[PDB]
Model the fold of this input.
Amino acid sequence: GRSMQAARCPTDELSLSNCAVVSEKDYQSGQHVIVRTSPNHKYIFTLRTHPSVVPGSVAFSLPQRKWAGLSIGQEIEVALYSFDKAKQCIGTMTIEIDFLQKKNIDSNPYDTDKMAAEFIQQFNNQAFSVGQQLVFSFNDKLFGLLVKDIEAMRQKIEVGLVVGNSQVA
Amino acid sequence: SADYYKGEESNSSANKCLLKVAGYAAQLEQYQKAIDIYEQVGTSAMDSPLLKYSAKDYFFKAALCHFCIDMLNAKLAVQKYEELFPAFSDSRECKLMKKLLEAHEEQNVDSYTESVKEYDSISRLDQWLTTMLLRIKKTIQGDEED
Amino acid sequence: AEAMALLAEAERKVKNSQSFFSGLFGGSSKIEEACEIYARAANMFKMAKNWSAAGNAFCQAAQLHLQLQSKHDAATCFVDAGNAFKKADPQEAINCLMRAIEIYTDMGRFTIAAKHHISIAEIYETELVDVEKAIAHYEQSADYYKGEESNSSANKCLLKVAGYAAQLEQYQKAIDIYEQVGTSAMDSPLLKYSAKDYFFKAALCHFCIDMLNAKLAVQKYEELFPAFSDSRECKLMKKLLEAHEEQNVDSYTESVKEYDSISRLDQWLTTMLLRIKKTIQGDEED
Amino acid sequence: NRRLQQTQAQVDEVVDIMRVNVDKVLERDQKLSELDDRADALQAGASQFETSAAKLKRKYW
Amino acid sequence: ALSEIETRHSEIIKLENSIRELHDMFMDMAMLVESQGEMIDRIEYNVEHAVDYVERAVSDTKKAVK
Amino acid sequence: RADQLADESLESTRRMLQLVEESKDAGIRTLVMLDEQGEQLDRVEEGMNHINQDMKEAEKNLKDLGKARENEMDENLEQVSGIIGNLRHMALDMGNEIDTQNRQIDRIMEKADSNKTRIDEANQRATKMLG
Done:
């Protein structure tokens, strides 16, 4: 891979997509990579170019930086990763949801059926790992998802790739 | 000006001006440069055990001033602060701060807005504090639909 | 308007005129001209924050002023230079001050001499970290203050002397000072309430005496029960005197923990209390 | 009991004492502040007199 | 009796309150008086010294007429 | 809450001491100086008077040459009370020192000015007979 430099997420829009924002002079939207912080810390994200990212640097959101334990201005190695649509195809992934910001906690009901519908309509063809932390934009409301288990189309995998026909619980 | 005072041995006056500098510096977005000024004026105040007395408020202001850091610059600044619970002066500086840091480092916006309502009792909140506190109350919300 | 230029002209004029240039009348005015030069230089050196240069410059104008026969306004310059070097980066700060005091002192100006004497003992402590020399100055200076019927200032210095004297090792020599500053404090009903802490310190200071110097010093103190100022002084002391006379480093360290509630302890007290804590532990596994 | 509801004013009265104590001292600050600009400026003119009187000495004496 | 115990607290706090602020004043006080103390240390200096400048002038003038 | 107030406020009464005690400490430094300075201004005033004299002579020369919880909660109050008296002690020493010096400043400002004029007039008559 090529030595990159961690940065901050451009806009909030890409901060709710849970995707590593990069430049159009390095990678292209649709590709996957594996960030390396140390010999015993490997993570996988999804790229999403933006006319703001500087060549030779990858920007991460607040949640991601907390999960992967990244810092603003540290050296990291990024290498292209190719998924295997033969074992990493997600079909049943259990997620642990909870109010991201304890600032706005309510007791109102939230239809799950509508969630799983908008979940795949926004997080399709992306990489999700077990124990990963992200943000979910549901009805202008922010949440904090936490993958607990992933099942392919039953073998439980560590990392998978959500597709169109992917069920979510 | 504070530089000139600081060369005339007149410590008091020097700090008097520095307070103005940082004070209006944080009200102009220069939050970090402010905490730094508070650190300097805080170090050049302990040398005089007759200033130990005002040396609190500085830590409170500095801990309040935030340059949008993601670490615990404030949780660290409040730590550097030496305090003893039975003490009083001190209870008018960090005690509140801790509660504010928890309401911020924990992403909750009721406990912060209510703690600022409680502290406003034992210690009246001046103009400055108010303005900044609201800015933090908004960093919370701003962090909210973010 | 260039300092570097002035420093040169001054030199060119500061020198006992020779040959025809001298004639009969000396250069008592020339030396003064040079002083004015260096002063102007030190001046712009102070606006430039070149401090070092400012101070050394004042030193020049000052020394020359001495060569003119005007100790007063000279010494004044020595002070200016001291204020420069202090808030500067080089040294000389201590030298200028000593050179200032020798003048205020032999000129007939002890008031101001002591004013700078305490400044000296303050720098030789907060900078040079030379406690033994600082105490010597705080003392000799308090003598002058006490002479200018400035009891107030005198004690301000004595407190320093004893205070750091208990920190070094001089616990006895500390209590003696507390006794003197205590006797010469009651003559002023404006220090009655403060006269407590004195007895507290003096009773805390121990020169490894076996008798009851403290149990006696606490008795010399006049207290009742409906007094609340006194509550922060001997009442605690007695409890400490009993915890020491019973080799119980658990009752002493507990009482200090309780008293630290109604009256927050300071660095000084802490250090000494721990010293007494060790004398006790040091008496137990003993 | 009653002492509590009572002693309350035993300080509210002092809160007023200092209110004046803080003002009294501050009033002196300005009186000494101006005196600092007229007294120091005074000797400043004396310096002009010291130089003038010194020269009248090297000519008529 | 509760009523007296609750009313007690009400008056106690209203008391506790007024107290804390009076303490706030002295803090600022010690910071003012001291800031003024240094403003006088220079006065005493400029005064007794001005006496030297004037004394040297009045002396030279006298020895300039006799 | 009931007990969290009868004791917390009780801690405030205990603290109410150091609060009014730290005030004395702050008052001492003030008084100690007000007294020290009082004597200083005496030697300072001598300056305005010393110059007032010399200038008169200097002017003449320039003219001649020119031609049980509640039981304690009740006790703490008594403690504050005993200290309140002290606050009066300093309040008076501070007061009597303030009024006595303010009027002193008046005399100082007067003579200082009076002499300033003599210096200016003399400086306008001397500067001409320069060199």
